Amino acid sequence: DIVMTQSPLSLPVTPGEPASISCRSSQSLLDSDDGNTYLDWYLRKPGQSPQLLIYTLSYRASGVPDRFSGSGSGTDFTLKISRVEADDVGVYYCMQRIEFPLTFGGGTKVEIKRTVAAPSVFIFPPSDEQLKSGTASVVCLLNNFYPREAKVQWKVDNALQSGNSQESVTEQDSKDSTYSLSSTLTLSKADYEKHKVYACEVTHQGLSSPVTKSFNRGEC
Amino acid sequence: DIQMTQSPSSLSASVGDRVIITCRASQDFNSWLAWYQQKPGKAPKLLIYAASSLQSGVPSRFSGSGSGTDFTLTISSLQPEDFATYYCQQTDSFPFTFGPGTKVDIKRTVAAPSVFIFPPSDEQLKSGTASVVCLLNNFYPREAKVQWKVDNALQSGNSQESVTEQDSKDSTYSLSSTLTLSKADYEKHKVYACEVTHQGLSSPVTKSFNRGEC
Amino acid sequence: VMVSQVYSGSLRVLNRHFSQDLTRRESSAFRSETAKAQKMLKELITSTRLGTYYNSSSVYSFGEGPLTCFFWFILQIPEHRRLMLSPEVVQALLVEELLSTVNSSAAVPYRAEYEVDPEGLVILEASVKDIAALNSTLGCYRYSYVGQGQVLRLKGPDHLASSCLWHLQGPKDLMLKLRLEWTLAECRDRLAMYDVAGPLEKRLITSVYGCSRQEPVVEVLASGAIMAVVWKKGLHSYYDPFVLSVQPVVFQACEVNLTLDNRLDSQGVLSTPYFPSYYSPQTHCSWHLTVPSLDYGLALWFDAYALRRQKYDLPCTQGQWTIQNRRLCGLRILQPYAERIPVVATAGITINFTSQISLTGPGVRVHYGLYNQSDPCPGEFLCSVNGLCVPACDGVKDCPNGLDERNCVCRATFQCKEDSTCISLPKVCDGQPDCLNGSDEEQCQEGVPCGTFTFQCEDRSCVKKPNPQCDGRPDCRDGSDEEHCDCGLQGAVSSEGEWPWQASLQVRGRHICGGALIADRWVITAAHCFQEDSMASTVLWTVFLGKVWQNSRWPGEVSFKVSRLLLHPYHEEDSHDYDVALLQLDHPVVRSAAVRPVCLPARSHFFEPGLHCWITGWGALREGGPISNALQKVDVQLIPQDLCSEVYRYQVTPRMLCAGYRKGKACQGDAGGPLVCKALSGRWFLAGLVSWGLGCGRPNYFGVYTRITGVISWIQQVVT
Amino acid sequence: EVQLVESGGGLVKPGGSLRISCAASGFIFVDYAMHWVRQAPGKGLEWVSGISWNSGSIGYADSVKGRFTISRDNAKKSLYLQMSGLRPEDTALYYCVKSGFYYVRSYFDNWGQGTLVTVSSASTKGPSVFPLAPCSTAALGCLVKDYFPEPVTVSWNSGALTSGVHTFPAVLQSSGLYSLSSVVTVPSSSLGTKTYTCNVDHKPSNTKVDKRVES
Amino acid sequence: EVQLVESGGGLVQPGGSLRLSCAASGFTFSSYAMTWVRQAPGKGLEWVSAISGSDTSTYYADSVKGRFTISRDNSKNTLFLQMNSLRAEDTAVYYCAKHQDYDFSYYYSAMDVWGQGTTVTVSSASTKGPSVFPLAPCSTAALGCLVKDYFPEPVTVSWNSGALTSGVHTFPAVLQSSGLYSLSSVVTVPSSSLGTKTYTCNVDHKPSNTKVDKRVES
Ligand SMILES: *[C@@H]1O[C@H](CO)[C@@H](O[C@@H]2O[C@H](CO)[C@@H](O)[C@H](O)[C@H]2NC(C)=O)[C@H](O)[C@H]1NC(C)=O
Ligand SMILES: *[C@@H]1O[C@H](CO)[C@@H](O[C@@H]2O[C@H](CO)[C@@H](O)[C@H](O)[C@H]2NC(C)=O)[C@H](O)[C@H]1NC(C)=O
Ligand SMILES: *[C@@H]1O[C@H](CO)[C@@H](O[C@@H]2O[C@H](CO)[C@@H](O)[C@H](O)[C@H]2NC(C)=O)[C@H](O)[C@H]1NC(C)=O
Ligand SMILES: *[C@@H]1O[C@H](CO)[C@@H](O)[C@H](O)[C@H]1NC(C)=O
Ligand SMILES: *[C@@H]1O[C@H](CO)[C@@H](O)[C@H](O)[C@H]1NC(C)=O
Ligand SMILES: *[C@@H]1O[C@H](CO)[C@@H](O)[C@H](O)[C@H]1NC(C)=O
Ligand SMILES: [Ca+2]
Ligand SMILES: [Ca+2]
Ligand SMILES: [Ca+2]
Known part of the structure; x- marks a missing residue:
């Protein structure tokens, strides 16, 4: 068992400057019999299968560009990205194969910094089919915004509700490096028909003032 | 670690007989067992190793067999130059440990021991101690028990017994038991007896003596 | 409850002549002839008492000579009468119906167009499954006739069709012989061969499943003059997986009559007709042999075949052998067998071979000879179960009950006679007396009678000295133990020529196995290296000689190609038994200092337990890693076979030996690597091949190797 | 090119058993090692088992040793994994990995799409x-x-x-x-x-x- | 013909020191592991200590651990046993025995050639008349x-x-x-x-x- 540590846990890099990822083992990776270091660097893309970037600490695969350079000594290993593009987004792993059982590393996220983006806010009321199910769902949607921090909240008849809404945010984008967020809110029949208005308000750095979107119950 | 053991602890056969000796370790070792053939007064001789292989020069009357935990040494036919002490050792792993040992005597007719008593002499009485001896002569086999009875009481730890070797003429045995006491322990007791129990007699014969008249 | 019974038959017509257009079903003339024949058959069936149960008739094929229509018919009859409508009864009824109308002045409607011969009508039973099998194969179909002395080559099959049938017809008085040859390396087609006109399961001569490497030729005989061949499931599309030839063969009697000479050698062979072709389903062989005297019994040595007992009602598939009114049935097993027949009253011996059922196996060949009744094996031990002479008291159990190794004087050790004391074999005839009064070094030069560990010179003479082969001094009158002693001379990491006989067997640039050069053109190895799927092809492999470093080429090494590859016939993959293989080189080796063959031990060579030998094989230095870049030598100590027999419990055979490594650690041993052992004369003798083992990391387990002295006979037979 | 298709997966009772299998094409199957790599829904990658070019050196992980069994069949060109004694931790997404060389300790070359194995007490439902x-x-x-x-x-x-x-x-x-x-x-x-x-x-x-x- | 001759036994005070020597003859001394086996008078054989083919490693028993010391001189073909801190339970006959192999890493390690034996007696009392x-x-x-x-x-x-x-x-x-x-x-x-x-x-x-x-x- 060789415990592998990676540093830093996360790193935001804008396109243009190099980046460095460090992997530290618990032993030394030198098979004495051949003098070959048994460390490999893999990249897991968002929602795809992991790829192979570097094998034996120096060599690259048949499709990896020159922007990746592996190096190291004994216990301390470094992967360097010369110029960071918008596609090198994902989690990076370092794996050793000098003893059984092989152990994958810990992971290191990569985030691409860009300019400030204004989210697009939409309100999606419950459909007619879900009214007979006994529960109604209304969803607030934001998309195409940077940076990631943005606080979404609901207002039902000028009242604040907590502990009853669920938010989900996708991963980083490949071409423009943005985010999309969806906040769903479910109410019972005893609560939905007893209210009239429903509003969604968001606080984000890209807007000077918190914008709101509201709708009436029974206007369409 | 491993604790070897053998059975029987003694034997008695005649020329032409077939003898069987068993060796059982406490836990199996892979049957790397060895047998030795110590004569009464000489160096041991290796007969069989690996529990079946035979050493060059050994007569082809010894056979080794067994496996697991139980091993066996077989003498097909006895010979005059074959009565000795046989030891089994296990030669794999480091506390090398021999067996207790098996003695092979020469079988003959059952003989009744002759029992004699001897009172302590006056020269011994003037030294400060006391020594009373009882002698068993010309019996067979070795298995015979001796007890010391004083005033109808049993002793222990103050008597030493010694036996001779098997005779070269009639193959018999002689035993002598010596009881050592002090003058104070000798004065305050009246009667002394050397009780003998042996299968050669239907009833244990007794021998008692007193002082002050003989 | 109505049940449908199927009858398939052939009817001969003398008023019609066969034409080539009838061979193609798509021809209009063939369709018209089929319609007319079906109408005539329906009329004939309805004319008899079976017309009340007639269901449907269809003409299937036409034959050469007089117009022979092969058709099938169905009868829907009550179940209670099903046992009454036997094929013989139907044939008799049809014959009676045909014969009754001949004398009558009334003309049958079918008789006005077709004149049928009553003697030519043949009817056989069939099943609904047989109907479906025939009725799905109504596509790919050809008919052909084979003349006397002419060999016919197939017409290529159509890959589109999923099931093709050839209907073969020859002379009435001649048998048909069919030859199958496997062109592709491995293939997944299925073939079936039947003795009748249609695919009737009860008449199946033989079914070939799979597509094997061991034997490329399959020769099948047919009892009759007609034959059917059905090919199915060409799964992966290609062309020409196999080749059929066919020819007519004369029938001859295999029964013979001979008198044995005065000898102890195998005097001849007895074989089924047309060996090694599959014997005819209705064969019958009778062999009569006369022994010269009552003191000799008869020995029959089989090859991959054996006899055993049977219960009388049971019919045995393999075949029936009757030996002097004793009945026996064969059992094809991968072990040698010998049947020994004593003589008590009559010098004549009668051996009968009969085929009991329709299914036929491959031909049987048995060597016959004489043996002195008393002490049948001279200087050997006869194993009772399988009647073979096995060595006695050599430390190896060669009989299932182990009676050869029991209650003898000196097991694997020499016996002084002056005082009965066992002494070691290397001390016999060495040059100093070790028996108390010199018996060990007597009669060392003259001829002796053979026993255990007695090297037998070329003139069937014996030698007292153990291991006299290749020791730089003549030891028998013949002088055959010093001829061809050019091997075994040398020139942790091995050096540049420390082990000249080591060879690397590689495919696609990677080392799968290692081997030992035993002759100028032969390399021995283990069989389990070719167990894999794609690796069995001879073209793939390449052999490297005189190399130590896998990484980079060095001046010494030479590379050859594998010409032939022979596995041992009795090799068993599941038990690793008989694990040995031979590779023939492209051209012979030039004996430089880098490459030299290893010396093959004789059948009586003594490998002493407790001796140290060396395993020179490439191996993965660490668990799960690549093979080491340097050839690594390691020493092991031989173990008595009793010990590892107790270790492995019914899994080690007389063909294997056992060696142990250094205690407390290694296990890396390669596959097919040698186990050479040094002799007293400075020459290395190949004592085994790396076969298998359990426990890399188990504390006290051994490695199991192919005992070469147990397979030396086959090696010498193949090499010479 | 190189194709690896996994099959099996699905919902398993916590205590039952399962068998999953790969399906390789595009390369000579009996030349390379084969591995199984599971990824938790919110954790990193984790090795499971690996087998050599001819099942000569099977080696398992530490947490799944004794419960899983990897095997292959060079004839059908397929990889099998017998998994048993499932626990609520074993739920993950499994990848069939084709290595770069003939031994278990070579770099991972090709990755399959993977199949999801989940364990729970509740039964299936409809979306x-x-x-x-x-x-x-x-x-x-x-x-x-x-x-x-x-x-x-x-x-x-x-x-x-x-x-x-x-x-x-x-x-x-x-x-x-x-x-x-x-x-x-x-x-x-x-x-x-x-x-x-x-x-x-x-x-x-x-x-x-x-x-x-x-x- | 192999022989092993021993010398060095005698009277020793209960706490003194002694050194026994074993001279070999007839075989190659530098390719076999040796051992010392003691037998108390009137009792069974007991292993004491052993030594590998060439000084590589020495082995002891439990009851004599830390007191005895075995050594080998291959130049003069001799095996020495140095004993110190003797007790009253160390009186016995000592035999110099030879093994079948160079060391104890393999499986054949039986004792085949033995010595005659030397009697080492340890007591506190001095000489006295019968x-x-x-x-x-x-x-x-x-x-x-x-x-x-x-x-x-x-x-x-x-x-x-x-x-x-x-x-x-x-x-x-x-x-x-x-x-x-x-x-x-x-x-x-x-x-x-x-x-x-x-x-x-x-x-x-x-x-x-x-x-x-x-x-x-x-
Ligand atoms: C075999 O296929 C054939 C068609 O080629 C079927 O033959 C027909 O069988 C029916 C039975 O109801 C008869 O009425 C027809 O006259 C037959 N036609 C010919 C051309 O013979 C036959 O049924 C199929 N076999 C099976 C078992 O279903
Ligand atoms: C084999 O053929 C020979 C003749 O060729 C037969 O042997 C004869 O046996 C009869 C017994 O009635 C003797 O009277 C003859 O003298 C024998 N003739 C010869 C030439 O030896 C023998 O019987 C034949 N085999 C069988 C099974 O009948
Ligand atoms: C071995 O086969 C021969 C024929 O080759 C058998 O001899 C026949 O025996 C029967 C007995 O029922 C006689 O009716 C025949 O006339 C014999 N024929 C010949 C040609 O001799 C012989 O019986 C067979 N032996 C056994 C044991 O079955
Ligand atoms: C033949 O028999 C089958 C089954 O009994 C029946 O269904 C069918 O109608 C019959 N066909 C003819 C042509 O009589
Ligand atoms: C057959 O063997 C016996 C016993 O071995 C022998 O006496 C006899 O001479 C032998 N007979 C022949 C003809 O060789
Ligand atoms: C051999 O040994 C002794 C000693 O010389 C001699 O007396 C005896 O007769 C000899 N024995 C034989 C069988 O020749
Ligand atoms: Ca034997
Ligand atoms: Ca000699
Ligand atoms: Ca010679």
């Missing part, structure tokens, strides 16, 4: 689909709700259009069900001209539901 | 004399300077708790010769140069 339309450019979508277990495949026009499609990861509700929504952004000129519909695929429930979205 | 006392009772009768409180072994007992040797019995000496030996000699004679023929037993001790002629009578 409920709802269309969602609002009432420059606008957005419109459809959500699936109350389905178990993973995964569900939501597409638009059977995969015709793929620009502006956003699918959110499944969220575990308090009850124990999952729900997500797929949304497409479109210019407001073709709302009442071209109809928009989405199809959902659920293998554990074996349902293909088509729903047209409109206000 | 004490010879008569032994007579108060068919056939039996007389004798008892030797008590003598050190060290051995002592020779004869009857009439060898004139009487039919019916003699000299039992092995028994070691008492006081550190001094004692034995007896008994001769069976017909009862009719008691009053007619006399008997003298002769006791001879070499280390204490003592000769005692004792008359035995009723």
Whole structure:
């Protein structure tokens, strides 16, 4: 068992400057019999299968560009990205194969910094089919915004509700490096028909003032 | 670690007989067992190793067999130059440990021991101690028990017994038991007896003596 | 409850002549002839008492000579009468119906167009499954006739069709012989061969499943003059997986009559007709042999075949052998067998071979000879179960009950006679007396009678000295133990020529196995290296000689190609038994200092337990890693076979030996690597091949190797 | 080129057993090692088992030693994994990995799409689909709700259009069900001209539901 | 013909030191592991210590761990055993035994060639003269004399300077708790010769140069 540590846990890099990822083992990776270091660097893309970037600490695969350079000594290993593009987004792993059982590393996220983006806010009321199910769902949607921090909240008849809404945010984008967020809110029949208005308000750095979107119950 | 053991602890056969000796370790070792053939007064001789292989020069009357935990040494036919002490050792792993040992005597007719008593002499009485001896002569086999009875009481730890070797003429045995006491322990007791129990007699014969008249 | 019974038959017509257009079903003339024949058959069936149960008739094929229509018919009859409508009864009824109308002045409607011969009508039973099998194969179909002395080559099959049938017809008085040859390396087609006109399961001569490497030729005989061949499931599309030839063969009697000479050698062979072709389903062989005297019994040595007992009602598939009114049935097993027949009253011996059922196996060949009744094996031990002479008291159990190794004087050790004391074999005839009064070094030069560990010179003479082969001094009158002693001379990491006989067997640039050069053109190895799927092809492999470093080429090494590859016939993959293989080189080796063959031990060579030998094989230095870049030598100590027999419990055979490594650690041993052992004369003798083992990391387990002295006979037979 | 297709997976009782298998093509199968690599839904990669070119050196992981068994069949060109004694930790997504050389300790070369193995006490359910339309450019979508277990495949026009499609990861509700929504952004000129519909695929429930979205 | 000759046994105080030497002959000393096997008088064999083919590693028992020390000199073909901090339980006969292999890493490690043995006795008491006392009772009768409180072994007992040797019995000496030996000699004679023929037993001790002629009578 060789415990592998990676540093830093996360790193935001804008396109243009190099980046460095460090992997530290618990032993030394030198098979004495051949003098070959048994460390490999893999990249897991968002929602795809992991790829192979570097094998034996120096060599690259048949499709990896020159922007990746592996190096190291004994216990301390470094992967360097010369110029960071918008596609090198994902989690990076370092794996050793000098003893059984092989152990994958810990992971290191990569985030691409860009300019400030204004989210697009939409309100999606419950459909007619879900009214007979006994529960109604209304969803607030934001998309195409940077940076990631943005606080979404609901207002039902000028009242604040907590502990009853669920938010989900996708991963980083490949071409423009943005985010999309969806906040769903479910109410019972005893609560939905007893209210009239429903509003969604968001606080984000890209807007000077918190914008709101509201709708009436029974206007369409 | 491993604790070897053998059975029987003694034997008695005649020329032409077939003898069987068993060796059982406490836990199996892979049957790397060895047998030795110590004569009464000489160096041991290796007969069989690996529990079946035979050493060059050994007569082809010894056979080794067994496996697991139980091993066996077989003498097909006895010979005059074959009565000795046989030891089994296990030669794999480091506390090398021999067996207790098996003695092979020469079988003959059952003989009744002759029992004699001897009172302590006056020269011994003037030294400060006391020594009373009882002698068993010309019996067979070795298995015979001796007890010391004083005033109808049993002793222990103050008597030493010694036996001779098997005779070269009639193959018999002689035993002598010596009881050592002090003058104070000798004065305050009246009667002394050397009780003998042996299968050669239907009833244990007794021998008692007193002082002050003989 | 109505049940449908199927009858398939052939009817001969003398008023019609066969034409080539009838061979193609798509021809209009063939369709018209089929319609007319079906109408005539329906009329004939309805004319008899079976017309009340007639269901449907269809003409299937036409034959050469007089117009022979092969058709099938169905009868829907009550179940209670099903046992009454036997094929013989139907044939008799049809014959009676045909014969009754001949004398009558009334003309049958079918008789006005077709004149049928009553003697030519043949009817056989069939099943609904047989109907479906025939009725799905109504596509790919050809008919052909084979003349006397002419060999016919197939017409290529159509890959589109999923099931093709050839209907073969020859002379009435001649048998048909069919030859199958496997062109592709491995293939997944299925073939079936039947003795009748249609695919009737009860008449199946033989079914070939799979597509094997061991034997490329399959020769099948047919009892009759007609034959059917059905090919199915060409799964992966290609062309020409196999080749059929066919020819007519004369029938001859295999029964013979001979008198044995005065000898102890195998005097001849007895074989089924047309060996090694599959014997005819209705064969019958009778062999009569006369022994010269009552003191000799008869020995029959089989090859991959054996006899055993049977219960009388049971019919045995393999075949029936009757030996002097004793009945026996064969059992094809991968072990040698010998049947020994004593003589008590009559010098004549009668051996009968009969085929009991329709299914036929491959031909049987048995060597016959004489043996002195008393002490049948001279200087050997006869194993009772399988009647073979096995060595006695050599430390190896060669009989299932182990009676050869029991209650003898000196097991694997020499016996002084002056005082009965066992002494070691290397001390016999060495040059100093070790028996108390010199018996060990007597009669060392003259001829002796053979026993255990007695090297037998070329003139069937014996030698007292153990291991006299290749020791730089003549030891028998013949002088055959010093001829061809050019091997075994040398020139942790091995050096540049420390082990000249080591060879690397590689495919696609990677080392799968290692081997030992035993002759100028032969390399021995283990069989389990070719167990894999794609690796069995001879073209793939390449052999490297005189190399130590896998990484980079060095001046010494030479590379050859594998010409032939022979596995041992009795090799068993599941038990690793008989694990040995031979590779023939492209051209012979030039004996430089880098490459030299290893010396093959004789059948009586003594490998002493407790001796140290060396395993020179490439191996993965660490668990799960690549093979080491340097050839690594390691020493092991031989173990008595009793010990590892107790270790492995019914899994080690007389063909294997056992060696142990250094205690407390290694296990890396390669596959097919040698186990050479040094002799007293400075020459290395190949004592085994790396076969298998359990426990890399188990504390006290051994490695199991192919005992070469147990397979030396086959090696010498193949090499010479 | 190199193709590896996994099969098996699905829902397993916590204590039952399963067998999964790969399906390799595009290369000489008996030349290279084969590995199984499982990834937790929110953790990193983890090795499971690996086998050499001819099953000569099988080696397992530490947490799954004695419970799993890896094997191969060079004839059918396939890899099998017998997994037994399942626990609520063993739920993951499994990848069939083709190594770079003939030994277990060579670099991983090719990765398969992987199959999801989940374990839970609850049984399967059917996804409920709802269309969602609002009432420059606008957005419109459809959500699936109350389905178990993973995964569900939501597409638009059977995969015709793929620009502006956003699918959110499944969220575990308090009850124990999952729900997500797929949304497409479109210019407001073709709302009442071209109809928009989405199809959902659920293998554990074996349902293909088509729903047209409109206000 | 292989031989192993030993030397170095003798009287040692309970706490002193001793060194035994084993000289080999007939074989190659530098290719076999050796061992020392001790046997207390009247008891079974017991392993003591062992040594590998060439000084590579030494092995000991449990009851002699830290006290004894085995060593090997391949130049003069000799095996040495240095003992110190001796006790009263280390008196025994020592044998120099040879193994079948170079070391103990393999499976064949039996003892095939042995030495004659040297007797190492450890005691606190010093030399003293044998004490010879008569032994007579108060068919056939039996007389004798008892030797008590003598050190060290051995002592020779004869009857009439060898004139009487039919019916003699000299039992092995028994070691008492006081550190001094004692034995007896008994001769069976017909009862009719008691009053007619006399008997003298002769006791001879070499280390204490003592000769005692004792008359035995009723
Ligand atoms: C075999 O296929 C044939 C068609 O080629 C079937 O033959 C027909 O069988 C029906 C039975 O109801 C008869 O009425 C027809 O006259 C037959 N036609 C010919 C051309 O013979 C036959 O049924 C199929 N076999 C099976 C078992 O179904
Ligand atoms: C084999 O053929 C020979 C003749 O060729 C037969 O042997 C004869 O046996 C009869 C017994 O009635 C003797 O009277 C003859 O003298 C024999 N003839 C010869 C030439 O030896 C023998 O019987 C034949 N085999 C069988 C099974 O009948
Ligand atoms: C071995 O086969 C021969 C024929 O080759 C058998 O001899 C026949 O025996 C029967 C007995 O029922 C006679 O009716 C025949 O006339 C014999 N024929 C010939 C040609 O001799 C012989 O019986 C067979 N032996 C056994 C044991 O079955
Ligand atoms: C033949 O028999 C079958 C089954 O009994 C029946 O269904 C069918 O009608 C019959 N066909 C003719 C042509 O009589
Ligand atoms: C057959 O063997 C016996 C016993 O071995 C022998 O006496 C006899 O001479 C042998 N007979 C022949 C003909 O060789
Ligand atoms: C051999 O040994 C002894 C010693 O010389 C001799 O007396 C005896 O007769 C010999 N024995 C034989 C069988 O020749
Ligand atoms: Ca044998
Ligand atoms: Ca000799
Ligand atoms: Ca010779």
